[PDB]
Amino acid sequence: AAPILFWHRRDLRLSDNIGLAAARAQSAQLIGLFCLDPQILQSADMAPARVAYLQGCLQELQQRYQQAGSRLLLLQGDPQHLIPQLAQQLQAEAVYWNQDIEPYGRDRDGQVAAALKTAGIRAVQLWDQLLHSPDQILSGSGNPYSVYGPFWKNWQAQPKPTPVATPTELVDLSPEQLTAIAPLLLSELPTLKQLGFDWDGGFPVEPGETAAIARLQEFCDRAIADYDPQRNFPAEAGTSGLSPALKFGAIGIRQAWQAASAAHALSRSDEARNSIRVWQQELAWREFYQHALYHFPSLADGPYRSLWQQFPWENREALFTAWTQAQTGYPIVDAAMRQLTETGWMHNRCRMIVASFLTKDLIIDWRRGEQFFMQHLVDGDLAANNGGWQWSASSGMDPKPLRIFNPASQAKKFDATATYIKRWLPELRHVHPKDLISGEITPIERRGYPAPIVNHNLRQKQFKALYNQLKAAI
Numbered sequence: 001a002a003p004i005l006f007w008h009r010r011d012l013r014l015s016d017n018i019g020l021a022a023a024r025a026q027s028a029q030l031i032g033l034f035c036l037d038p039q040i041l042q043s044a045d046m047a048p049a050r051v052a053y054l055q056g057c058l059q060e061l062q063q064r065y066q067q068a069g070s071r072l073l074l075l076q077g078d079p080q081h082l083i084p085q086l087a088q089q090l091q092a093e094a095v096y097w098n099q100d101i102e103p104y105g106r107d108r109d110g111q112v113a114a115a116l117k118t119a120g121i122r123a124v125q126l127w128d129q130l131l132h133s134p135d136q137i138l139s140g141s142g143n144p145y146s147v148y149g150p151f152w153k154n155w156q157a158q159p160k161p162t163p164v165a166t167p168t169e170l171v172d173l174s175p176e177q178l179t180a181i182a183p184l185l186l187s188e189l190p191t192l193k194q195l196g197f198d199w200d201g202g203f204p205v206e207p208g209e210t211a212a213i214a215r216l217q218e219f220c221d222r223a224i225a226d227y228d229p230q231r232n233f234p235a236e237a238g239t240s241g242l243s244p245a246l247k248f249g250a251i252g253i254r255q256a257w258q259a260a261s262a263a264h265a266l267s268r269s270d271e272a273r274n275s276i277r278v279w280q281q282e283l284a285w286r287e288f289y290q291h292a293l294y295h296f297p298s299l300a301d302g303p304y305r306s307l308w309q310q311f312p313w314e315n316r317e318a319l320f321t322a323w324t325q326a327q328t329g330y331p332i333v334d335a336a337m338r339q340l341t342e343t344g345w346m347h348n349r350c351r352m353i354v355a356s357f358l359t360k361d362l363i364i365d366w367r368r369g370e371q372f373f374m375q376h377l378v379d380g381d382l383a384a385n386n387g388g389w390q391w392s393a394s395s396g397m398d399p400k401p402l403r404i405f406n407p408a409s410q411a412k413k414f415d416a417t418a419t420y421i422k423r424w425l426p427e428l429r430h431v432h433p434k435d436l437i438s439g440e441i442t443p444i445e446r447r448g449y450p451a452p453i454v455n456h457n458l459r460q461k462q463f464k465a466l467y468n469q470l471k472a473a474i
C-alpha cells in the first residue's frame with residue numbers, strides 16, 4: 001500500500017500538530033513513529049529526568065495512536081539509516097515531520113530527507129513548535145534580530161496562528177506490512193530502567209499530552225491573572241510549570257497562545273490583563289532564543305561575542321564541584337541547586353541567580369554550567385539554556401552592560417522571608433531569614449552547612465579586573 005509516516009521528535013502529542021495535521025489531510029493511513037537515537041540517548045548531556053518525562057509522553061502517545069485507528073512505531077538506532085529503510089519497506093508515499101532549530105537535528109534532517117529522496121520517497125518538513133518560524137521574522141533589511149526589543153515589536157504585530165485539527169479515523173498497518181518492517185521495530189516501549197536510567201524526583205507537570213492540556217487550562221483559568229508579579233518569587237508557585245511540556249511538545253504552541261489569549265479576552269481587570277500579556281511575552285522570549293539559535297548556530301559553541309571568546313576563565317574545578325553539589329555556602333544559591341538536582345526543575349529567578357553566581361562569582365567558563373543544567377533539567381533546551389547562560393555574561397544575544405548579581409540582594413529582593421531557602425535547605429530552618437539572606441551564618445548555628453566558598457566582594461573585583469584588563473588589551 002501507500003501509507004504516510006509521521007516522525008515524532010519534540011511533538012509528542014496528537015493534537016494541534018502542524019505536520020501531523022498536514023499528513024492526515026493527505027492520507028488516513030497515517031502511522032506515527034519515534035526513533036530512539038543513540039547519539040542523543042547515550043549523550044553525557046542527557047538528563048535522567050528528561051528521559052523519564054519523555055518516556056511518559058511516549059506511553060500516552062502510543063495510546064493516542066491506538067485510539068485514533070493506527071499505531072506508534074518504535075525504533076532504536078541511527079535515524080538516517082533506519083527511517084529511510086522503514087519508509088522503503090513500507091513503500092511510504094511520504095515521511096512528514098516538524099522542523100528543528102538545533103544544529104544536530106537540522107543536520108540529521110537534511111540527511112534523512114536526502115536519503116528519502118534517493119529512495120524516491122517524499123519528505124515534508126513543516127514548522128510546528130514556533131508561533132512564527134525563523135524565516136517569518138526578519139528586519140526591514142531581511143535580517144535576523146540579535147536584540148530583543150525590535151524582535152518583540154515585529155513578532156507581536158504578526159497575525160497569530162490557531163490550533164489545527166486532531167487526526168481521527170486512521171487506518172492501521174496490515175500483517176503483511178508489519179512483517180515487512182518487523183526487523184526494524186522494538187517490540188515494546190522500553191522502560192526507563194531498561195534504558196539504564198532512574199528518576200524518582202517527580203515533575204513540574206505529569207508527563208503526557210492530557211496532563212499538559214490540563215495544566216494549561218488550570219493555569220490560564222486562575223494563576224495566570226497574578227503572573228505579574230507572582231512570577232518573580234521562587235517561593236510562590238506563580239509560573240505554569242509547562243516548560244517540559246513545551247520542550248517535548250506535550251502541548252501545542254498554538255493551544256498555549258490561544259488559551260492565554262482567551263483568558264485575556266475573558267478578563268475584565270487591568271492587572272489581570274497585564275499579567276496575561278506578560279506571560280505571553282515569555283512565549284516571545286522563547287521564540288527569540290530559538291530563532292537566534294536557528295539564525296546563529298555557532299551560539300551553541302559557547303561565548304558568542306568576540307571579547308568573551310577570550311575571557312580568562314579561572315576554572316577552579318573545586319568551586320564548580322561545590323556549585324553542582326549545592327555546597328557553595330550561599331543559601332539562595334544552594335537551595336536552588338538542590339531543587340534542580342532533586343526535582344529536575346528550577347524557578348527562573350533562581351536559574352538567573354545560580355548562573356550569575358557560577359559565571360561572575362566562581363568565574364567558571366559558563367559552558368560547564370550550561371552542561372550541568374542540561375544534565376539535570378527536565379526541560380533542558382539548547383536554545384533556552386544557551387540563551388540563559390550567554391545571558392549570565394551578556395556574551396550572546398541582547399547584550400547588556402557588565403553587571404554582577406549580589407546573591408544577598410537577590411535573595412532579600414525575591415525571597416524576603418527566606419521561605420524558599422528554608423524549603424530546600426531544611427537543615428537551616430532554625431536559622432533566621434535575616435542571616436540566610438545575608439549568607440552570614442554563625443558556625444555553631446551553621447551546623448554542618450558549609451561556609452561561603454568565596455568572598456563575593458573579592459570575586460566581584462576579580463571579575464571586573466579581568467574584564468577591564470581584557471577590554472583594554474583589545
Ligand SMILES: Cc1cc2nc3c(=O)[nH]c(=O)nc-3n(C[C@H](O)[C@H](O)[C@H](O)COP(=O)(O)OP(=O)(O)OC[C@H]3O[C@@H](n4cnc5c(N)ncnc54)[C@H](O)[C@@H]3O)c2cc1C
Nearest residue numbers: 239240241242243286348351352355379380381384385388
Ligand atoms: C541559566 C538559565 C538556563 C535556562 N534553561 C532553560 C532550559 O534548558 N529550558 C527551558 O525551557 N528554559 C530555560 N530557561 C528559561 C526559564 O528559566 C524557564 O523556561 C522556566 O523556568 C520554565 O518554568 P515555567 O514553565 O513555569 O515558565 P513560565 O513562566 O510559565 O513561562 C512559560 C513558558 O515560556 C518559556 N520561557 C519562560 N522563560 C523564558 C526565557 N527566559 N527564555 C526562554 N523561554 C522562556 C518556557 O517555554 C516556559 O515553559 C533558562 C533560564 C536561565 C536563566
